[PDB]
Amino acid sequence: WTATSGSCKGRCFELQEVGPPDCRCDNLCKSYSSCCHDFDELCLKTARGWECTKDRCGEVRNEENACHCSEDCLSRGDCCTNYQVVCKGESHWVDDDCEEIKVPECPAGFVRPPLIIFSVDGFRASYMKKGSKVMPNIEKLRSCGTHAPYMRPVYPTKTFPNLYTLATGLYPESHGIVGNSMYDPVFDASFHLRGREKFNHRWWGGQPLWITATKQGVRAGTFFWSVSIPHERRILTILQWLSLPDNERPSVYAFYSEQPDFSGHKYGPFGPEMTNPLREIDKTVGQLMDGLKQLRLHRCVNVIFVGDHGMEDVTCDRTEFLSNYLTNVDDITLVPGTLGRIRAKSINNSKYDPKTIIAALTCKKPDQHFKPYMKQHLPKRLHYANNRRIEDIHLLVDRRWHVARKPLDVYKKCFFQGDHGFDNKVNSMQTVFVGYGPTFKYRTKVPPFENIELYNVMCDLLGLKPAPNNGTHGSLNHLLRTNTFRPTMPDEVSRPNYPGIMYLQSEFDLGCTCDDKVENKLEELNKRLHTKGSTKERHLLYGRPAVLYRTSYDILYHTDFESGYSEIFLMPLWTSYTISKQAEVSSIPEHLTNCVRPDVRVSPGFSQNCLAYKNDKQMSYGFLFPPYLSSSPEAKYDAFLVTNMVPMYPAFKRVWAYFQRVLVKKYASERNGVNVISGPIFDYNYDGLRDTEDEIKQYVEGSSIPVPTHYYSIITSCLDFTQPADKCDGPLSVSSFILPHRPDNDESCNSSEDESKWVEELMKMHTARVRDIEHLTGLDFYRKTSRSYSEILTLKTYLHTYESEI
Ligand SMILES: *[C@@H]1O[C@H](CO)[C@@H](O[C@@H]2O[C@H](CO)[C@@H](O[C@@H]3O[C@H](CO[C@H]4O[C@H](CO)[C@@H](O)[C@H](O[C@H]5O[C@H](CO)[C@@H](O)[C@H](O)[C@@H]5O[C@H]5O[C@H](CO)[C@@H](O)[C@H](O)[C@@H]5O)[C@@H]4O)[C@@H](O)[C@H](O[C@H]4O[C@H](CO)[C@@H](O)[C@H](O)[C@@H]4O[C@H]4O[C@H](CO)[C@@H](O)[C@H](O)[C@@H]4O)[C@@H]3O)[C@H](O)[C@H]2NC(C)=O)[C@H](O)[C@H]1NC(C)=O
Ligand SMILES: CNC(=O)CN1CCN(C(=O)[C@H]2CC[C@@H](NC(=O)c3ccc(Cl)c(C(F)(F)F)c3)C2)[C@@H](Cc2ccccc2)C1=O
Ligand SMILES: [Ca+2]
Ligand code: NA
Ligand code: NA
Ligand SMILES: [Zn+2]
């Protein structure tokens, strides 16, 4: 119930919300059907439109008008945004040369530069160049402030998950808004774009910027506008709020535009109909900037222009139907479109089986335009599994396509020509970031970055301490002139042991054999030196990784590689080695095919054994430092140490062996040497975080040898590839992956073919940030470089995407 009999007199766009049944006058009252009877009359005036004209200049104030051109309007804070241009001979902001803003130029009473976030739905990154001719205001923000060529959204590339990620710094799996549509099985409740359930606070996790601000005494404008409030009125409302007395005025404000998304769905991302929406959004930007200039705020306010996601060409004829795959299509519920999510239609149906559904959906048609995954097997870079609202079965849909349950869903629900939601590395899904104002840099281009990083920067802009989030605070310091956040490196928690030779060969009973009994004071001293770390500077280029949790581990040195060997997990946590451009690949000699050698530095009790692998019929083994890349026949024996062995399914060994034998040398050739750090990951509960020992669900049969869920590699070289990786003077270049350790290659439809036709494609899909690997391992990399810590934080958040030019 709402008693709409109350009045909005002097309450229009009030900031504090009034609880039911008292009628509301705030920017969301329409969405709740709760506005006071006179809200339209008082608060949504439209008379005479939005622009002053010559004849209105000096007019007698008429309170009915949408905006004012009277002499008193500046002191009232309600002039039309073009008032000083039409009536006082001033220029439009867009017509002014840009001039560096070295310091905030704020009116007295301003305690801090306000922040205004101007968000645009569906604004694809390439609009900034392709539409620049029709967007002069936006082009000026971009060219004069700080801009990235694009900003990476989160998956799924849908509006609600992305706006809420912008507001919180959190992945959707952590903030809870995992799609525009959701079912929560604990609540037994459904969230949809239409309807009231979506306003219930139980859906919305983390702490969004407006709550962060309010809790730390920084006032916020309300971030949400009912769709029927025209943009011109939204702008005038923000400008009115900025004229409030000091103690009442907000410091942070948001404007949201439904365009260009609305038209992009109708017309496609580059439909001729798209020029006009771009022009209209530019005009709104120009109204805001003109209004700020009128208020003498245009060299005080920080403005962020940011999108949620882009827009791809998608039409009804490009739809895959589950009814062409599944015999049992009426037994499932599908959340459809540019991603699929599948669960049982009825929890009472005990004939429901996810394994048979996955199998019926796997590589069934030559051109199949979606791929099914159990959510734990999705690429870890998506961070899309740790939430009860994400169904176990997920369909990753190819760009330009939809998935639907049956044909009748698509015609008895072509209309549309555009859509979004696909994998967040897809070029068409990329969106925009520009920052302009005294706290941002002048005429500065920054590399692409992820939208999860922005909350921390918005907190920095406002002097707020951010709530815990998934950004890496300091990785965007290079966007800012001042207010940088200068983090310190985390402290190492566990210090390594450095074991010498402590066991005789006969103390081992591991069931391993090696043909290594083949027998010099020149070389003997030399090999001792290698085992004490004499080659360590070549192979451990950025210092040893720090272990940020409590554990017992040993540093093991060798001619060609160094490792940190866990006595708890019985294998290395990391293995580090450098491969120069000149390195040669060799074979594993015939007599060494099955060679595994006890490591006389490590007790039998803290070693793997070969018998466990003999008896586990499903499990084989591989090595972290590859025997193919040994520096010499003699050094090759080190690669067969039991301390360099890790459990690998035969199907995975196909992938791993190709990576080690062919790809590492390819990368060293292309990048002028590479440094590689490789190791296992254990994430059985798919939370993105290192498992403890009691979370491990699978062991090599009969043993305490845990089986990794993934294997990672971090591949580093010199950004200036004229310098070799091991003699690099400046910034670094990195690519990394987290490959799923799976007992089949069902993910790869072409895996019956030679590895040269499918393995690199798999690796590219599972590209990762170094930071993703840090979360999954409890390790901290790049501890000892010549580089500033913020630069290293930016390097750790890099994702190599393998898409071509935007
Ligand atoms: C991205 O960044 C985020 C933020 O930093 C990282 O997420 C944090 O990770 C932590 C570990 O997973 C987690 O810490 C736990 O907090 C528990 C209390 O949680 C509540 O309070 C906080 C603070 O206000 C709140 O934010 C939480 O919000 C979650 O839950 C509500 C729903 O209730 C959602 O609305 C919201 O969206 C959010 O959900 C997300 O996280 C939860 C996990 O908390 C998931 O279940 C969801 O799917 C979703 O992803 C909560 O309201 C605390 O109880 C935990 O403590 C357990 O473990 C510790 C060890 O330290 C131990 O002391 C205790 O014994 C305890 O164990 C007991 O409970 C077990 C499970 O019930 C049980 O098995 C045991 O036997 C014990 O009884 C724990 O410390 C923290 O909550 C989140 N924060 C957020 C916002 O998500 C995230 O990891 C980053 N991602 C990456 C990849 O880096
Ligand atoms: C009819 N309405 C439309 O068709 C378009 N539309 C825009 C407004 N709206 C929202 O803003 C949602 C999206 C996620 C969160 N918003 C940000 O999290 C958010 C909003 C603005 C900005 Cl500017 C930012 C950010 F971070 F970028 F600054 C975040 C609330 C819902 C409606 C809604 C408001 C409040 C709670 C629930 C739903 C929406 O349906
Ligand atoms: Ca885990
Ligand atoms: Na085996
Ligand atoms: Na296959
Ligand atoms: Zn859309």
Swiss-Prot record:
Q: Where is this site: Essential for catalytic activity?
A: 796
Q: Where is the active site?
A: 159 (nucleophile)
Region called Nuclease-like domain, residue ranges = 541-806
Q: What is the effect of changing residue 159 to S?
A: 15% of wild-type lysophospholipase D activity
Localization per Swiss-Prot or TrEMBL: Secreted
What main location does UniProt list? secreted
- Cystine crosslinks: 8-25, 12-43, 23-36, 29-35, 52-69, 57-87, 67-80, 73-79, 98-144, 106-300, 316-414, 363-749, 512-610, 514-595, 718-728
Reported impact of residue 265 to Q:
20% of wild-type lysophospholipase D activity
Q: Which UniProt keywords apply?
A: Calcium, Chemotaxis, Cleavage on pair of basic residues, Disulfide bond, Glycoprotein, Hydrolase, Lipid degradation, Lipid metabolism, Metal-binding, Obesity, Repeat, Secreted, Signal, Zinc
What's a single GO CC term here? Answer: membrane
Pfam families linked to this entry: Endonuclease_NS, Phosphodiest, Somatomedin_B
Question: Which parts of the sequence bind 1-(9Z-octadecenoyl)-sn-glycero-3-phosphate?
Answer: 159, 180, 261, 420
For the ligand (Zn(2+) 2), the binding residues are 261, 265, 420
Q: Does the keyword Endoplasmic reticulum apply?
A: no
EC supergroup of this enzyme: hydrolase
Tissue expression as described in the entry? Abundantly expressed in cerebrum and cerebellum. Localized in secretory epithelial cells in the brain and the eye including choroid plexus epithelial cells, ciliary epithelial cells, iris pigment epithelial cells, and retinal pigment cells.
Domain (SMB): give its ranges. Answer: 4-47, 48-92
Q: Where is this region: Required for secretion?
A: 773-794
Does the record's keyword annotation contain Nucleotidyltransferase? no
Positions with a binding annotation for Ca(2+): 683, 685, 687, 689, 691
Protein residues bound to 1-hexadecanoyl-sn-glycero-3-phosphate:
159, 180, 261, 420
> Where do glycans attach?
3, 348, 360, 470, 750
Q: Which family does it belong to?
A: Belongs to the nucleotide pyrophosphatase/phosphodiesterase family.
**What does the UniProt entry state concerning the protein's domains?**
The nuclease-like domain is most probably catalytically inactive as residues that are essential for catalysis in the DNA/RNA non-specific endonucleases are not conserved. However, it is required for the stability of the protein and the catalytic activity born by the Phosphodiesterase domain.
State the name under which the record lists this protein.
Autotaxin
> Organism source for this protein?
Rattus norvegicus (Rat)
